[PDB]
Design a protein around this ligand. Structure first.
Ligand SMILES: [Zn+2]
Ligand SMILES: [Zn+2]
Lengths: 414, 414
């Protein structure tokens, strides 16, 4: 299991695991932020991200003081510690750490490694007293920010290139998440009065995190692949994306057809073969310092390629099949919920109610690494009572209308 | 199997199976229409109903001439003949004919039958030459209109009462459909090039009809029951209604929870028990002509009640279970599609593409009772090629932008 490092927000810059970084590529002089490497290749940036019915949670004041940055940082670490408490989440974190993006993309020459590209590298600033600060490239797998203007809208992405998309073509891409750990999704369950009624529950934010991490993993493997578009009417994407459904509950035959399964399977396979074909012709790097054979070995390990006695890489069908299934159907939100004794929504189509806030995720009488909210010593384990809005009221507070912007779905002229 | 009668639009009023009827209850003097009883308790009224992305089909000119009324009428009959060609659709039609609404509703005294209520009776006008025309009550199960302003929007309903809703409380209610037989839904299938691509298909309008008929049946049994509302935010209905999903494909465990299944089961059972309790105390009718024991027998047969040696009705659990399952899980769009060799959408969540028009449903070289579009002698049976937009082009025509209003889904202030 991966090591997870503790930090205080005010711990000094050391240019190693506490740094100034510029993660959005450059207007030349861009904005640098204080970042914390809690796990290899995984950084927390405790700052706001600035670069039927629906509830947007606003809070302009979230993450403005150093005290609150520190709380965000500590909460993120606690959540990773939680994920790290059980073998499945441990495996999730090991696989992310290992899933280094390919040194290149569709526009890099196939016979080269190129680290100096936006899907691979950000700017890091080496802070030295007495001399001018140097700007150095830095490779990462995952950067976690705080939220943009809307807190209730956790979201994972890349910066995608001119034309092509590395996260869907096997190259993969360094991943960024916007996250609010203290903002809890709320859902329903129709439940038998130990008469039937709707019982309201709130998310365990570690499972919320694990969900985005699944996406991260798919993106890093370059297999975040879209369903065919719906193209003639005006071209547009399928409302029901198979990778989204996979991330929630693996196969979903009643919603995703076996043909759609197969199409995505075949495109992931072709993506891996493309990477193997590239590896067989890479003979140098665009810049200096890149040791080719070392990175060939890393990618062989990441994509689980076979290597013949001449050094040629190929995709083995059994090895691909086992790795694909792990990535698409092994790590799902509902598998992990079950492993962790966490209640989640019944289905991908269940609606969210208005979100709620907790200030108590660092309080071990309320939320623990090993049990989350569902603490057996308080009788909150049974029926996931610790996530039950009617039972575990001390865990959370409702969000006022001063924070909450409400919309209704309408049909309008395009 | 039910008899289905042939008619011409211009066949004269005979006050029996060709009548003037006023199906929306009264501004006093309301509007009367020429209606055709093709099956017992089932009437065709060939007139317009006046009382991600989205495509509304307008055609103000549809159903204005007598020639086109006649075509609508003949097409409706052909579609019922199609449904009537196989044992499952035969059973569907027999069950509708037999599922007379209860003579009353929540506001009628439990100890009476009341035929003169809006869920039961419409006005019929007896046309006699020489004398003033008499207005008489008329009980029906199903009235099929032409479309309202939007053709692309087939829809089934009642006129629901002040307060209560008979279609969800066991009483049931006479049902009305707005239907456009010649307006075809279009859907996709991701398909293996006998490379993967999206193949466009069009609906068989008989399966489209069968779908609404399922709803009709549920409504007539008083078991068109809503999921619990989502109530505190502002109260509203569940986007994913279990009866809608049942109508499409029966159980759907990945979407509908076993608790939601059970809640709806229990409420249907209670609805039947309420009807049985009423039957045990009905001793007269509000008006004249209603023979109580005859209608008690009809309802015993409809709801499959047991009768004890004292004349008391009760609900038998095995009999309810078998009837419930038939109504909710036996008659589904996907069961019937399979029985009829009709292609439909892969799931309830699949999106519709812009609709298309056929003028050829009365042409037996293109659409038949026994095979629909999928005619083996033209090699249109294999892979449902007769519903394939790319293969069976002669079957249909695309709808112009002069007819087609386009909307996009937006999030707006409520
Ligand atoms: Zn997701
Ligand atoms: Zn329906």
């Amino acid at each position: 299991p991966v090591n997870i490092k503790n930090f205080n927000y005010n711990d000094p810059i050391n240019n190693d695991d506490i740094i100034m970084m510029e993660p959005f590529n450059d207007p030349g002089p861009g904005t640098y932020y204080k970042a914390f490497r809690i796990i290899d290749r995984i950084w927390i940036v405790p700052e706001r991200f600035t670069y039927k019915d629906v509830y947007e949670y606003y809070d302009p004041t979230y993450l403005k003081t150093d005290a609150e940055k520190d709380k965000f940082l500590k909460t993120m670490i606690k959540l990773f510690n939680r994920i790290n408490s059980k073998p499945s989440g441990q495996r999730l974190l090991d696989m992310i750490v290992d899933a280094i993006p390919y040194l290149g993309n569709a526009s890099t020459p196939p016979d080269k490694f190129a680290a100096n590209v936006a899907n691979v590298s950000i700017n890091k600033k080496i802070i030295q007293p007495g001399a001018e600060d140097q700007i150095k490239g830095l490779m990462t797998n995952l950067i976690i920010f705080g939220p943009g203007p809307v807190l209730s809208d956790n979201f994972t992405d890349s910066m995608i290139m001119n034309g092509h998309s590395p996260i869907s073509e096997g190259f993969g891409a360094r991943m960024m998440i916007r996250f609010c750990p203290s903002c809890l999704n709320v859902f329903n369950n129709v439940q038998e009065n130990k008469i039937f009624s709707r019982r309201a529950y709130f998310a365990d934010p570690a499972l919320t995190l694990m969900h985005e991490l699944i996406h991260v993993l798919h993106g890093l493997y370059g297999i975040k692949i879209s369903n065919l578009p719906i193209t003639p009417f005006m071209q547009h994407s399928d409302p029901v994306q198979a990778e989204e459904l996979y991330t929630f509950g693996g196969h979903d035959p009643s919603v995703i057809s076996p043909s759609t399964d197969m199409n995505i399977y075949n495109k992931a396979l072709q993506n891996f073969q493309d990477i193997a074909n590239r590896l067989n012709i890479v003979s140098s790097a665009q810049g200096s310092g890149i040791d080719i054979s070392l990175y060939k070995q890393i990618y062989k390990n990441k994509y689980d390629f076979v290597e013949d006695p001449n050094g040629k890489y190929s995709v083995d069908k059994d090895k691909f099949d086992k790795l694909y299934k792990a990535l698409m159907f092994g790590f799902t939100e509902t598998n992990l919920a079950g492993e962790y004794g966490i209640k989640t929504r019944y289905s991908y189509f269940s609606e969210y109610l208005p979100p709620i806030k907790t200030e108590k995720l660092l309080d071990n009488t309320i939320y623990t690494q090993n049990e989350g909210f569902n603490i057996a010593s308080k009788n909150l384990k049974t029926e996931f009572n610790g996530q039950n809005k009617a039972v575990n009221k001390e865990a959370y507070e409702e969000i006022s209308l001063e924070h909450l912007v409400i919309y209704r779905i309408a049909m309008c002229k395009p």
